[PDB]
């Protein structure tokens, strides 16, 4: 119903991490360090380069000058306005990417402890939020020093990957590889928003294609719908499923919500199969699910995403890379590129996606292996 | 069943070149299959492996036990913290040592095999009370007094007759026919059956190479003043099996193994070198010579020397072989049980190898 973006100007205070890692706001505010203006989404090296503290790591041997910052802490801080919350609604603080080990505080109350830079982090701050200036503080610590909180095995020492990359859940290339430099970095490298969810809301809408007949233009699509639904709203909410493409409507099915989870099967007709590049057309259909009150017609939540009617099977021969991809029942030849980091400063990956995908379009790639 | 020995044990096994087969601290029986026990065992396994993975002596980890502990918790500790040494997830009637249970056991590598032998007199006089040094309760042989039953070993003071101690009188009655009443004659009788049995097994494994790959006998030393199947007691007392087995544990050892129509004089080499020498086999009682020839022992293999003819009745042969001007000795007891304790004691004294 509402999603206020917390992206923009933040306050970044960085200092050398002492023997005891700083965990609370009091220690970060009392520590001696340097304070500059930060941009979220963004890496801490971008915020320091915008202040003239570090030189361009992209030129010469200047990449080695960012070495001492690997043992630094990073203190993001800002204030935000609190949206109105009615009875039953929840206020979720959504981090898209925390790099990496950080302690999140809302009005001085710890709301979460992030330890992964590859997944999202959601925190219900419905109770701790007050009226007026709501402080938001994220105190990140060094990812290199965190590797010493573990005891590694023999088979985890001496490999191509860095031994600092073994115990933590980060991108291995951020530590050094053959086609990417060592830029570990830190910071909210993705979007930070404030989502408001109604008591009746869709938790997950999983689409799965069961059968595809690309010739007769038919397909069977299943929907595993999981929703949060107060019991007073049972038998009073309906699920609206709409399958459309290019504006025209193909299927519309309604069903009364008697359970929080249901499986809706759809025997669609007049639809096209999603084929890889070359073997057909990438036929996409906009699929939408909405939870509507059966009396007042009010929409509680809506999930919209484009799906594709396709089936995938890997026929492996082993002894007797000895496998072949089968899409929609046909053996396809895979020819494409391996996708590597779009930027050592991963917060700028979003600005390169549009340009880099077109490189595979001009290359006529029908497959791309996102490198681990 | 024992704790984990500290570093020195392994430092000495490194200095003197003794390979170590460490068994995780678990004994006869199945264990729990649940989380809280596997967590306590994983913590122990990681601790002991990291502590004892830099000693060249240790060569194998083994769990004594679809067991989650034997075929998972410990295999996982070895897979991550020591991929260099192998991990292994894995007696009988205790009758005559020439019974088909031992002579026809197809195991290439036996890890536990022993025979009972009463300790020395000086150990008995220090263990039991003065009124309990003699084993026979109320003077009748076979019946053990309560102090002898206690140190067999019985965990709980359930007072009873027989059991583990009966193996001593049973095995002596098999080889020598009748259990002696005198204590000094009983000590010599039990230790001789233990020595002739343990020596027979090592000779049976070293002599049947390349099929037989090893033999780990039980055991070398006792941990309590006790009456065991070990070859030496807590206090220093080398039972007679300790000396019989010294001569069948040499790097190059000549030994006679039984055969159907006769015997077989063999030699075993536990080195990577070749050795030449002469071997002379005589009869202790009569004094005649059975064989005398030069043998060639190639490296790391048993070599058959000669086929000795069948000997009449009972007696003892003497094996004397010289290698690089050094004379080494062994023997072979031919015939079938029972024997006479006085005749066997005289055969030993003539052979002159082992004191009495």
Short mmCIF file of C-alpha atoms in Angstrom, two decimals, chain B:
data_model
loop_
_atom_site.label_atom_id
_atom_site.label_comp_id
_atom_site.label_asym_id
_atom_site.label_seq_id
_atom_site.Cartn_x
_atom_site.Cartn_y
_atom_site.Cartn_z
CA UNK B 1 38.24 -48.07 26.24
CA UNK B 2 41.18 -45.87 27.27
CA UNK B 3 41.50 -42.08 27.39
CA UNK B 4 43.41 -40.30 24.60
CA UNK B 5 47.14 -40.44 25.32
CA UNK B 6 48.89 -37.02 25.44
CA UNK B 7 51.59 -35.86 23.02
CA UNK B 8 54.61 -37.65 24.57
CA UNK B 9 53.10 -41.06 23.74
CA UNK B 10 53.07 -40.02 20.12
CA UNK B 11 56.47 -38.31 20.39
CA UNK B 12 57.98 -41.58 21.59
CA UNK B 13 56.14 -43.47 18.85
CA UNK B 14 57.75 -41.01 16.43
CA UNK B 15 61.25 -41.39 17.89
CA UNK B 16 61.21 -45.20 17.90
CA UNK B 17 59.11 -45.56 14.75
CA UNK B 18 55.98 -47.28 16.08
CA UNK B 19 52.86 -46.73 13.98
CA UNK B 20 49.71 -45.84 15.92
CA UNK B 21 46.14 -47.04 15.29
CA UNK B 22 44.00 -44.67 17.42
CA UNK B 23 40.42 -45.77 18.25
CA UNK B 24 37.90 -43.06 19.23
CA UNK B 25 36.87 -43.27 22.92
CA UNK B 26 33.91 -45.65 22.52
CA UNK B 27 33.64 -49.28 23.73
CA UNK B 28 31.70 -52.49 22.99
CA UNK B 29 28.12 -51.34 22.39
CA UNK B 30 25.81 -49.09 20.33
CA UNK B 31 25.46 -45.37 21.21
CA UNK B 32 22.85 -42.65 20.84
CA UNK B 33 21.57 -41.54 17.43
CA UNK B 34 20.41 -38.07 18.53
CA UNK B 35 21.65 -34.52 18.09
CA UNK B 36 22.88 -33.61 21.57
CA UNK B 37 25.20 -36.62 21.74
CA UNK B 38 26.56 -36.17 18.21
CA UNK B 39 27.38 -32.56 19.09
CA UNK B 40 29.39 -33.59 22.16
CA UNK B 41 31.21 -36.25 20.13
CA UNK B 42 31.94 -33.96 17.18
CA UNK B 43 33.51 -31.45 19.57
CA UNK B 44 35.68 -34.24 20.98
CA UNK B 45 36.67 -35.65 17.58
CA UNK B 46 37.69 -32.27 16.15
CA UNK B 47 39.68 -31.56 19.31
CA UNK B 48 41.64 -34.82 19.31
CA UNK B 49 42.20 -34.92 15.54
CA UNK B 50 43.60 -31.38 15.38
CA UNK B 51 45.80 -32.27 18.36
CA UNK B 52 47.17 -35.54 16.92
CA UNK B 53 47.42 -34.96 13.15
CA UNK B 54 51.10 -33.91 12.99
CA UNK B 55 52.64 -37.17 14.24
CA UNK B 56 54.08 -39.46 11.53
CA UNK B 57 53.32 -42.48 13.73
CA UNK B 58 49.51 -42.23 13.63
CA UNK B 59 48.24 -43.98 10.50
CA UNK B 60 44.55 -44.67 11.09
CA UNK B 61 41.45 -43.37 12.86
CA UNK B 62 38.79 -45.91 13.85
CA UNK B 63 35.41 -45.91 15.55
CA UNK B 64 35.03 -49.03 17.66
CA UNK B 65 31.31 -49.36 16.88
CA UNK B 66 23.49 -47.53 10.26
CA UNK B 67 25.19 -45.88 13.23
CA UNK B 68 25.15 -42.09 12.96
CA UNK B 69 28.29 -41.93 15.11
CA UNK B 70 30.47 -44.55 13.35
CA UNK B 71 29.45 -43.89 9.73
CA UNK B 72 28.74 -40.12 9.89
CA UNK B 73 29.72 -37.86 12.83
CA UNK B 74 33.35 -39.10 12.86
CA UNK B 75 33.69 -39.71 9.10
CA UNK B 76 32.73 -36.04 8.75
CA UNK B 77 35.38 -34.90 11.25
CA UNK B 78 38.05 -36.88 9.40
CA UNK B 79 36.83 -35.69 5.99
CA UNK B 80 37.37 -32.02 6.90
CA UNK B 81 40.21 -31.98 9.46
CA UNK B 82 42.41 -34.90 8.35
CA UNK B 83 42.04 -36.22 4.78
CA UNK B 84 45.50 -37.84 5.00
CA UNK B 85 44.88 -40.82 7.27
CA UNK B 86 42.30 -43.53 6.51
CA UNK B 87 39.17 -43.87 8.62
CA UNK B 88 37.64 -47.24 9.44
CA UNK B 89 33.97 -47.43 10.52
CA UNK B 90 34.37 -50.85 12.17
CA UNK B 91 39.03 -64.76 20.95
CA UNK B 92 35.91 -66.85 20.36
CA UNK B 93 35.73 -70.11 22.31
CA UNK B 94 39.21 -69.41 23.76
CA UNK B 95 40.07 -73.10 23.49
CA UNK B 96 43.13 -74.84 22.11
CA UNK B 97 45.27 -72.41 20.11
CA UNK B 98 45.55 -74.95 17.25
CA UNK B 99 41.77 -75.25 16.98
CA UNK B 100 40.32 -74.52 13.51
CA UNK B 101 38.85 -71.30 14.94
CA UNK B 102 42.35 -69.77 14.79
CA UNK B 103 44.17 -71.83 12.14
CA UNK B 104 41.30 -71.35 9.65
CA UNK B 105 40.43 -67.72 10.42
CA UNK B 106 40.45 -65.98 7.01
CA UNK B 107 41.24 -62.54 8.49
CA UNK B 108 44.32 -61.04 6.85
CA UNK B 109 44.63 -58.50 9.70
CA UNK B 110 43.59 -59.56 13.21
CA UNK B 111 43.44 -56.66 15.67
CA UNK B 112 42.65 -58.51 18.92
CA UNK B 113 43.84 -61.99 19.94
CA UNK B 114 45.15 -63.10 23.32
CA UNK B 115 45.68 -65.99 25.70
CA UNK B 116 45.56 -66.21 29.48
CA UNK B 117 48.67 -66.41 31.64
CA UNK B 118 49.05 -66.17 35.41
CA UNK B 119 51.41 -63.37 36.54
CA UNK B 120 54.77 -63.91 38.21
CA UNK B 121 54.96 -65.03 41.84
CA UNK B 122 56.38 -61.70 43.00
CA UNK B 123 53.37 -59.94 41.48
CA UNK B 124 50.97 -62.37 43.17
CA UNK B 125 52.63 -61.86 46.57
CA UNK B 126 52.27 -58.08 46.22
CA UNK B 127 48.67 -58.18 44.94
CA UNK B 128 46.83 -60.55 47.26
CA UNK B 129 46.92 -60.79 51.03
CA UNK B 130 49.30 -63.37 52.56
CA UNK B 131 46.41 -65.80 53.15
CA UNK B 132 45.25 -65.38 49.52
CA UNK B 133 48.47 -65.74 47.49
CA UNK B 134 47.60 -69.38 46.84
CA UNK B 135 44.81 -69.45 44.22
CA UNK B 136 42.99 -72.59 45.33
CA UNK B 137 40.15 -71.89 47.74
CA UNK B 138 40.13 -74.56 50.48
CA UNK B 139 43.02 -76.39 48.81
CA UNK B 140 41.04 -77.85 45.89
CA UNK B 141 42.37 -76.95 42.44
CA UNK B 142 40.19 -75.08 39.95
CA UNK B 143 38.28 -73.29 42.72
CA UNK B 144 39.49 -69.69 43.04
CA UNK B 145 39.41 -67.76 46.29
CA UNK B 146 37.52 -64.48 46.47
CA UNK B 147 40.61 -62.29 46.12
CA UNK B 148 41.62 -64.10 42.92
CA UNK B 149 38.05 -63.78 41.61
CA UNK B 150 38.15 -60.06 42.47
CA UNK B 151 41.29 -59.40 40.38
CA UNK B 152 40.11 -61.35 37.31
CA UNK B 153 38.39 -58.61 37.18
CA UNK B 154 34.87 -58.41 38.55
CA UNK B 155 33.39 -54.88 38.48
CA UNK B 156 30.89 -55.60 41.31
CA UNK B 157 31.33 -57.68 44.57
CA UNK B 158 28.92 -60.36 43.31
CA UNK B 159 30.69 -63.26 45.08
CA UNK B 160 30.64 -66.44 42.89
CA UNK B 161 32.84 -69.21 41.51
CA UNK B 162 34.28 -69.64 38.03
CA UNK B 163 34.04 -67.38 35.03
CA UNK B 164 37.00 -65.50 33.57
CA UNK B 165 39.61 -67.12 35.82
CA UNK B 166 38.52 -70.58 34.64
CA UNK B 167 40.25 -69.86 31.32
CA UNK B 168 43.61 -70.32 33.05
CA UNK B 169 42.84 -73.79 34.42
CA UNK B 170 40.97 -74.82 31.26
CA UNK B 171 43.81 -73.95 28.87
CA UNK B 172 46.39 -75.56 31.16
CA UNK B 173 44.24 -78.70 31.34
CA UNK B 174 44.11 -78.77 27.52
CA UNK B 175 47.85 -78.51 26.83
CA UNK B 176 49.33 -80.14 29.95
CA UNK B 177 46.44 -82.48 30.79
CA UNK B 178 46.05 -81.72 34.51
CA UNK B 179 46.27 -78.48 36.48
CA UNK B 180 49.18 -78.53 38.96
CA UNK B 181 48.46 -78.01 42.64
CA UNK B 182 51.74 -76.25 43.45
CA UNK B 183 51.66 -72.51 42.79
CA UNK B 184 55.12 -72.34 41.23
CA UNK B 185 54.18 -75.26 38.97
CA UNK B 186 50.89 -73.54 38.10
CA UNK B 187 52.66 -70.29 37.19
CA UNK B 188 55.06 -72.15 34.90
CA UNK B 189 52.15 -74.10 33.40
CA UNK B 190 49.92 -71.11 32.66
CA UNK B 191 52.70 -68.85 31.36
CA UNK B 192 53.94 -71.65 29.09
CA UNK B 193 50.52 -72.22 27.51
CA UNK B 194 50.22 -68.47 27.02
CA UNK B 195 53.71 -68.26 25.51
CA UNK B 196 53.30 -71.29 23.24
CA UNK B 197 49.95 -69.93 22.04
CA UNK B 198 50.88 -66.29 21.37
CA UNK B 199 54.10 -67.42 19.69
CA UNK B 200 52.11 -69.88 17.57
CA UNK B 201 49.81 -67.12 16.31
CA UNK B 202 52.53 -64.64 15.30
CA UNK B 203 54.34 -67.50 13.56
CA UNK B 204 51.05 -68.46 11.88
CA UNK B 205 50.59 -64.94 10.44
CA UNK B 206 54.21 -64.14 9.54
CA UNK B 207 54.47 -67.60 7.98
CA UNK B 208 51.35 -67.28 5.80
CA UNK B 209 52.33 -64.12 3.93
CA UNK B 210 51.64 -62.51 1.48
CA UNK B 211 48.00 -63.26 2.41
CA UNK B 212 48.33 -62.39 6.10
CA UNK B 213 49.08 -58.68 6.40
CA UNK B 214 49.37 -58.09 10.15
CA UNK B 215 48.59 -59.28 13.65
CA UNK B 216 47.92 -57.11 16.71
CA UNK B 217 47.99 -59.29 19.82
CA UNK B 218 46.40 -58.47 23.18
CA UNK B 219 48.23 -57.29 25.05
CA UNK B 220 51.66 -56.09 26.19
CA UNK B 221 51.11 -54.50 29.59
CA UNK B 222 48.38 -54.41 32.29
CA UNK B 223 47.03 -51.16 33.76
CA UNK B 224 46.16 -52.61 37.18
CA UNK B 225 47.66 -55.26 39.46
CA UNK B 226 45.29 -57.83 37.91
CA UNK B 227 45.09 -61.38 36.43
CA UNK B 228 44.79 -60.85 32.65
CA UNK B 229 45.70 -62.25 29.25
CA UNK B 230 48.55 -59.74 28.98
CA UNK B 231 52.21 -60.71 28.62
CA UNK B 232 53.42 -58.33 31.35
CA UNK B 233 51.80 -57.01 34.51
CA UNK B 234 51.48 -53.49 36.01
CA UNK B 235 54.58 -53.68 38.13
CA UNK B 236 57.29 -54.88 35.72
CA UNK B 237 56.67 -58.60 35.68
CA UNK B 238 57.49 -59.98 32.26
CA UNK B 239 55.41 -63.15 32.00
CA UNK B 240 57.10 -65.89 29.95
CA UNK B 241 55.13 -64.91 26.86
CA UNK B 242 57.12 -61.66 26.70
CA UNK B 243 60.33 -63.58 25.97
CA UNK B 244 58.87 -66.22 23.64
CA UNK B 245 57.40 -63.46 21.46
CA UNK B 246 60.64 -61.46 21.37
CA UNK B 247 62.20 -64.14 19.16
CA UNK B 248 59.21 -64.31 16.79
CA UNK B 249 59.12 -60.50 16.38
CA UNK B 250 62.60 -60.07 14.86
CA UNK B 251 63.08 -58.27 11.57
CA UNK B 252 64.38 -61.54 10.08
CA UNK B 253 63.05 -64.59 11.93
CA UNK B 254 63.20 -68.32 11.15
CA UNK B 255 60.18 -70.28 12.38
CA UNK B 256 58.61 -73.69 11.80
CA UNK B 257 54.90 -73.94 10.94
CA UNK B 258 52.77 -77.10 11.12
CA UNK B 259 51.99 -79.17 8.05
CA UNK B 260 49.93 -82.24 7.23
CA UNK B 261 52.69 -84.74 6.37
CA UNK B 262 55.51 -82.98 8.16
CA UNK B 263 56.52 -79.41 8.97
CA UNK B 264 57.70 -76.33 7.07
CA UNK B 265 60.79 -74.33 7.99
CA UNK B 266 60.07 -70.74 6.95
CA UNK B 267 61.75 -67.35 7.30
CA UNK B 268 60.06 -63.94 7.41
CA UNK B 269 61.57 -60.56 6.53
CA UNK B 270 59.87 -57.39 7.78
CA UNK B 271 62.48 -55.13 6.14
CA UNK B 272 63.27 -53.77 2.68
CA UNK B 273 66.68 -55.49 2.60
CA UNK B 274 67.96 -58.94 1.67
CA UNK B 275 69.71 -61.23 4.15
CA UNK B 276 71.60 -64.51 3.85
CA UNK B 277 72.42 -66.96 6.61
CA UNK B 278 72.47 -70.56 7.77
CA UNK B 279 69.76 -72.29 9.81
CA UNK B 280 70.17 -75.50 11.83
CA UNK B 281 67.21 -77.40 13.28
CA UNK B 282 67.84 -80.14 15.85
CA UNK B 283 65.76 -82.22 18.26
CA UNK B 284 66.15 -81.17 21.89
CA UNK B 285 65.44 -84.56 23.47
CA UNK B 286 67.35 -87.00 21.25
CA UNK B 287 69.95 -84.53 19.99
CA UNK B 288 69.83 -85.52 16.32
CA UNK B 289 69.82 -83.03 13.45
CA UNK B 290 66.69 -82.54 11.34
CA UNK B 291 67.97 -79.92 8.90
CA UNK B 292 70.95 -77.64 8.30
CA UNK B 293 71.18 -75.44 5.22
CA UNK B 294 71.76 -71.92 3.95
CA UNK B 295 68.63 -69.81 3.40
CA UNK B 296 68.04 -66.66 1.36
CA UNK B 297 65.42 -64.27 2.74
CA UNK B 298 64.30 -61.75 0.14
CA UNK B 299 62.94 -58.39 1.23
CA UNK B 300 59.42 -58.09 2.67
CA UNK B 301 58.17 -61.64 2.08
CA UNK B 302 58.05 -65.05 3.70
CA UNK B 303 60.44 -67.53 2.07
CA UNK B 304 60.01 -71.29 2.34
CA UNK B 305 63.29 -72.99 3.25
CA UNK B 306 62.74 -76.75 3.53
CA UNK B 307 60.08 -79.36 4.28
CA UNK B 308 60.98 -81.02 7.57
CA UNK B 309 59.91 -84.67 7.92
CA UNK B 310 57.38 -85.86 10.47
CA UNK B 311 58.76 -86.37 13.98
CA UNK B 312 57.77 -89.30 16.17
CA UNK B 313 55.81 -88.73 19.37
CA UNK B 314 56.18 -85.51 21.34
CA UNK B 315 59.17 -83.23 21.76
CA UNK B 316 60.70 -79.89 20.83
CA UNK B 317 62.83 -78.75 17.89
CA UNK B 318 65.40 -75.96 18.17
CA UNK B 319 65.82 -73.30 15.47
CA UNK B 320 69.26 -71.65 15.39
CA UNK B 321 70.01 -69.22 12.57
CA UNK B 322 72.95 -66.85 12.09
CA UNK B 323 72.74 -63.55 10.18
CA UNK B 324 75.79 -61.27 9.88
CA UNK B 325 77.66 -63.18 12.58
CA UNK B 326 74.73 -62.87 15.02
CA UNK B 327 73.05 -66.04 16.28
CA UNK B 328 69.28 -65.89 16.84
CA UNK B 329 67.15 -68.64 18.35
CA UNK B 330 63.63 -70.06 18.12
CA UNK B 331 61.86 -73.39 18.60
CA UNK B 332 58.86 -75.47 17.59
CA UNK B 333 56.81 -77.80 19.80
CA UNK B 334 55.72 -80.79 17.72
CA UNK B 335 53.13 -83.40 18.63
CA UNK B 336 49.58 -83.17 19.90
CA UNK B 337 48.28 -82.41 23.41
CA UNK B 338 48.23 -83.36 26.23
CA UNK B 339 51.85 -83.25 27.46
CA UNK B 340 53.73 -83.69 30.74
CA UNK B 341 54.71 -80.57 32.65
CA UNK B 342 58.03 -82.06 33.76
CA UNK B 343 58.99 -83.16 30.24
CA UNK B 344 58.22 -79.74 28.75
CA UNK B 345 60.23 -77.99 31.48
CA UNK B 346 63.22 -80.19 30.63
CA UNK B 347 62.94 -79.53 26.88
CA UNK B 348 63.07 -75.76 27.53
CA UNK B 349 66.15 -76.05 29.79
CA UNK B 350 68.11 -77.99 27.13
CA UNK B 351 67.20 -75.55 24.30
CA UNK B 352 68.90 -72.91 26.46
CA UNK B 353 66.98 -70.06 24.76
CA UNK B 354 64.56 -69.20 27.60
CA UNK B 355 65.34 -69.31 31.35
CA UNK B 356 62.85 -71.14 33.63
#
